[PDB]
From a paper:
To improve our understanding of molecular concepts involved in red light regulation of enzymatic functionalities and to extend the optogenetic toolbox, we focused on an artificial system that links the photosensory domain of a red light–sensing [name] from [name] (DrBphP, (4)) to a guanylate cyclase (GC)4 domain from Synechocystis sp. (Cya2 (5)), resulting in a novel red light–controllable GC functionality. Because this cyclase's substrate preference can be easily switched by a single amino acid exchange in the active site, our efforts also provide complementary [name] (AC) tools. The resulting constructs (phytochrome-activated guanylate cyclases (PagCs) or phytochrome-activated adenylate cyclases (PaaCs) for constructs based on the GCE488K substitution) sample different linker lengths and relative positions of the cyclase dimer with respect to the phytochrome over more than two full coiled-coil heptad repeats.
We eventually obtained crystals grown under dark conditions that allowed us to solve the crystal structure of the full-length photosensory module linked to the cyclase effector in the dark-state conformation to a resolution of 2.35 Å. The best diffracting crystal was obtained from the ATP-specific variant, but also PagCΔC forms identical crystals under the same conditions. As expected from the periodicity of hydrophobic residues in the linker element of the PagC fusion between the PHY domain and the CTE, the linker helices adopt a characteristic coiled-coil arrangement. This results in a tighter packing of the PHY domains and the presence of a stronger kink in the connecting helices between GAF and PHY domains when compared with currently available DrBphP PSM-only structures. Interestingly, residues at the C-terminal end of the linker helices of this light–activated construct are not in the coiled-coil register that would be expected based on CTE conformations of other class III cyclase structures. Although the overall cyclase dimer closely resembles those of other known cyclase structures as well as the isolated Cya2 structure, residues in the short CTE helices do not interact with residues from the other protomer as observed in all other CTE structures. They rather interact with the linker helix of the same protomer, thus “folding back” before proceeding to the cyclase core domain.
Residue numbers in the entry:
A (entry chain B): -1 to 733
B (entry chain A): -1 to 414, 420 to 733
The structure:
Amino acid sequence: GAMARDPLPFFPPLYLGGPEITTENCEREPIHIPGSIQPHGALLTADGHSGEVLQMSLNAATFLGQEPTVLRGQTLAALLPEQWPALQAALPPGCPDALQYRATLDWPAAGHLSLTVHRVGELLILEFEPTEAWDSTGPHALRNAMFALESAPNLRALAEVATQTVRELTGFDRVMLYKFAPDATGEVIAEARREGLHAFLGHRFPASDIPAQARALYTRHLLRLTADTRAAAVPLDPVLNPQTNAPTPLGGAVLRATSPMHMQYLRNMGVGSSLSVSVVVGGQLWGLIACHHQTPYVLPPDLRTTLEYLGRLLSLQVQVKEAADVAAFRQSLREHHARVALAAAHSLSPHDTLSDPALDLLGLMRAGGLILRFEGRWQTLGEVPPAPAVDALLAWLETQPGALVQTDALGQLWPAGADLAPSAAGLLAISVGEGWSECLVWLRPELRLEVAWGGATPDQAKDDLGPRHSFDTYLEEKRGYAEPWHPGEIEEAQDLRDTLTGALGERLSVIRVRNTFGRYLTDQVVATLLENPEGLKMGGDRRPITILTSDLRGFTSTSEGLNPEEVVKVLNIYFGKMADVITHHGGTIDKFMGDGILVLFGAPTSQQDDALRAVACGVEMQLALREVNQQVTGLGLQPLEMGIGINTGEVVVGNIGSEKRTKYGVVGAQVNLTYRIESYTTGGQIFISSTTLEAAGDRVHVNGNRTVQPKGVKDPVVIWDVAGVGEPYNLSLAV
Amino acid sequence: GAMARDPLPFFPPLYLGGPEITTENCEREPIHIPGSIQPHGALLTADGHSGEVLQMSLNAATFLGQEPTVLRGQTLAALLPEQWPALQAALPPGCPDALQYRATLDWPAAGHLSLTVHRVGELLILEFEPTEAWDSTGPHALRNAMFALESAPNLRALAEVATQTVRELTGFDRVMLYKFAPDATGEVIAEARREGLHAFLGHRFPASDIPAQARALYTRHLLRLTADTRAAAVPLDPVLNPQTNAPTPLGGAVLRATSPMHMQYLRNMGVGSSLSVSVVVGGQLWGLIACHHQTPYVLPPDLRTTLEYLGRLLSLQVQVKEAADVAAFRQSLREHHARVALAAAHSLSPHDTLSDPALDLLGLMRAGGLILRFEGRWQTLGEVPPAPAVDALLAWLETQPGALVQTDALGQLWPAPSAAGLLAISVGEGWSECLVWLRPELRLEVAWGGATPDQAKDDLGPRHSFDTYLEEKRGYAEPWHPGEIEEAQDLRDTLTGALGERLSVIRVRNTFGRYLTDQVVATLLENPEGLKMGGDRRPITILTSDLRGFTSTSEGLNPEEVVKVLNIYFGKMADVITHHGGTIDKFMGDGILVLFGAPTSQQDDALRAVACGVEMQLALREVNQQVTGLGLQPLEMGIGINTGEVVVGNIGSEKRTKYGVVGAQVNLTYRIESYTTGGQIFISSTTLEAAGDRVHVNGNRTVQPKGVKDPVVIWDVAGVGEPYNLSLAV
Ligand SMILES: *C/C=C1/C(=C/c2[nH]c(/C=C3[NH+]=C(/C=C4\NC(=O)C(C=C)=C4C)C(C)=C\3CCC(=O)O)c(CCC(=O)O)c2C)NC(=O)[C@H]1C
Ligand SMILES: *C/C=C1/C(=C/c2[nH]c(/C=C3[NH+]=C(/C=C4\NC(=O)C(C=C)=C4C)C(C)=C\3CCC(=O)O)c(CCC(=O)O)c2C)NC(=O)[C@H]1C
């Protein structure tokens, strides 16, 4: 950004053999050390401790009415017997160079003088200038303006009051408020002017009309002027400070000679006199009050002080009015902003929430297209570039520093993307966390706009070796720019980025609970578990739980002759319906081992009807397979068949994983027994153990039984064939 | 926070039957509508459209030089023939009541008068004051003050210039800068005064000395004065505005009579004249330039305007100076800040990064104790109260709103000793992950100007004593520096911004393998494509293990022995499997399933799987030392490995995916393991072929497990050669 770019190193001044200044090298003119002054005042420099005079402007003798011999090598003690002790008191040695001291002198000849002093290291710089010794303006003009500035209701009105007041105070033929853009171009956003004068209002001027080292200088010394655009500069004698054998810094002297480049610009523009006051906001040059007179004009010093004070006042009020205008913009989005904040705040699946048309993330930013990248997938709303180009933008976005990126001409910030101006000329992108792995990208189409320039566009700065001669309206078509993002839209995006980034709190814990307690647990069960962290006895515990295992009989063998995509599709269908059923019965899915399911009832938390719910779950799982086999045989494949075993008993519960990556699981002979029980089933059948049937109760309807001695058990056991469950399930296997 | 709390509703004023004002209700005094003015000026009110004069102060004739009947019911057009068109243009209908217009008048029997006008609703309010023949040589004192304030190096120095300059401009016997705290107590942070006056510098004063409705009014109308603290008010006549039959709002008139309660305070303090100017920063009352004279003093209006100018400049520079003071505090901490900023940004296990003493989160904030809650658990550095108080503090911090909680007296915020000061930041929203800085008690003595806030309602009028009253505060820590608040917010921003990076790795590990290395997770994220979630048939090598008979022996162990043994076993097996790039797929009871080929495949999948199996068997030697140390029997382990085409893809539901494998070659692996005995590794012929000549074998078996159409040869593995050089001990 040209405004946030320090000036180039300056070249040596002319009187040290520096180069001549043209529009090629003019950002390097050392305008702060011209070694000369404007002829309407006089300048002395003096040693800061002794007060010996070291330099005089060539006109100081004639100005201060003393022969040049006495003056040179006189002391300020003798030249200013009253003001010498005072400026020492006000400008103590070692004080900042910015500090200035002002006084009136009753001088022997031609009237009173205005004295302005400042210190630069070991050197005192004294400016002398005619004054009335009588404030022409009176007390009320400034006080009235200050209150009127503060009561202006918005930025535009504040600009009107500023230029209208300054022109009333000074009599200038033209007073402009000139506002710098981030690329250091500027625009006349208010103008008060004498009748019959050409209007510059609404015109943009190239950044080169005020070069970077002038803008830097104007950030530190807030007023400067050219009283007479025809007047020759007056040299300092000697031109170098003899304390240093180096140029005398003159940036803080209002009598500093103006650059010949700018002198010529003002003549071309028809200007006899010029003055500007910096508006500085947050340490940055926000703009200028820029004044012109058609004929030479020396603004009296007291009028200048009024201006300098208005400068300070305007610097604060520009900030106040800009914040109020932004807040008013956001005030009209309040209803919509709250609604978007509430949804984003607690949402655990951002993709389904932020793409809802009822949320209208597109309208919230007046965007033409929105990209949402969350988890691993990105979807879009509205007008976006073809899918190949969206992936190229997200790839370049990942390289951008920060968590917010904003531009109204994406083609310039990212060259390869200049082709995407029909839908992505402007872009506002925010990163949920750092790295752009999750982000939102509002896009805006190219908006062709005409720009009124003051005589020339920025690329015509070097057509001549000097300033241009025309400042009349020059229209240029703007290419590749979108409508700019309002500062309130920038803020809205910052608010929403913060909300989603905060929401990563839950999105990390619930995925961490599922890793420990159940990969397929419901968002309610996880919520239930987060509230009650204790009671779970991670270090180990033995207690009763019911275990259910199922397998698809021979599906692993029939899957060696299907498409790999058919297998995955069939397993996805099956597990989907199975998981819905098991969830409905409060079971914890513990493993999806191939085509087999293990379900726990009682871990992570138990209830008195664990066994009954497991049996009912088993029945409905079998019934659910009939719905599943419609799609499978719909796809052209053979029906699936399923056997289920259920056991109930004491198992060891706890962190059965490792220490660094825990898993709440169960271990013991009663787990293994469930598999042996399931191994006695055929398709459609459910075998349960005697402990399960006993624990489940009289609501379980059995078909018959078998005594079996599975390998792994010392004693024979009776297993029971389930036909159904009664109230309140009323679930029955078909026969 | 009494500063950001609106005033209470005022009570009706006395002349409408309201209650007498005492220290019981003085926050309800309607000080903006006294119906009266101070006697060094005169006041008219007129209709905003016709200019008809509606009220006059009772002294208006003496001031304006015309008896009341010629003034009353006359029109401002006739009375101010030049100023009437001007003040209408400056004060248009609807303008803010803050907006003021001033002019000078020259009248007979009246000298030069200052006329200050402003508009309240449909009413114009005109104030008349003696003023001076204009003779200034220019605003030199202002210009010099302006640059002196701008060059002040810090906030203390800025305050010193302001009071020094105001005293030089005015002659006031005492000039103070009075800075409000968030609780609306105030402190005199700079003072310029007569030598014979008792110093108030450094003293704090109760919030009630400037009540909430004075503070609110002082945020809109930036100057008020009491010219003579013994001068009697002058009634308005009539007292009520006839447009409304309601009181006339005088908040915006400098001549407004001062609250009687405050007049008595000034007298009790020995003050003869008073004036203060608001410092308003970001729309908030930051403080007052507060001035006392021991004798009466009517400041001419032109000199008040210079004070008003300095108030505006000082509102700007207080902002500039406080920021620079904070930036200078943090500049000392820069290298330390960068050091913590780097660590917290890229950490995927913040518990081990932040507890590092070389990171020095305690010293960064100059704290005595630090709590660190991340993921499931919490942990503490330095001096922390016990685990009940930490679990109770962490529970209560979930109560607090926002992401940052800052106090220097935790006993007051939360009733329930190493922690008198607390600074807490929420990583994300809700405090599920947070940092808590704790500071111990710092016995400080507050110097109060006469009395503590407890003694506000001791008598029905103001206090008489304003001498130093030292009060010992208990349960307090050294206050958090504003730079230390900014450092905590920065660190909170960083850790919260690192949640996205922490999120990407747990999402991937949740899909592709729970125990995956933080290194291979980075691999899957820079190359996310080609994984083929829809389905694919690829060769992979599969390794299954079991601890034979441990399921039975565990029925005789205490459950805590069972979990401890499995934790030791799995923890060692995981180390070995990860060293060999295996993907632990399931911890099935005491069994492990490991994939070599998923999610990614190298060309030596089979060899690594065989060598991993050998090392797991060897690693069981170091496990069986800890298991027998605990007094238990030693574990035995059998291993089977198979290599074959399997279906690879999303095997879970569509909603909760899991990258898994399915097929007969997966199931054959468990059958191959079932033939092993303790200490033995059986592998299939396809594994032996893919692994290559570096595998050392003992013998072989032809087996035909059911569910298999054709017999298969399995091979007993003795060890692995270069570069592994592992052999099963024999
Ligand atoms: C290659 C160098 C160039 C150059 C140099 C230059 N310009 C300035 C200072 C100013 N230029 C201003 C420009 C404007 N005045 C207007 O009235 C408008 C629009 C209506 C514009 C854009 C202004 C305002 C200033 C500030 C000075 C002032 O207030 O008069 C300097 C610095 C002068 C100095 O302080 O010594 C220099 C070196 N101007 C170019 O256009 C090219 C040729
Ligand atoms: C129960 C009511 C109380 C009360 C009322 C009250 N106080 C004010 C205004 C001011 N009080 C000030 C206090 C101080 N002056 C000092 O010099 C110091 C410290 C050294 C303090 C704390 C100040 C500065 C003001 C502003 C007025 C001024 O500049 O003199 C009002 C409002 C006055 C008005 O605008 O009419 C009221 C109602 N003060 C209490 O102490 C209790 C009794």
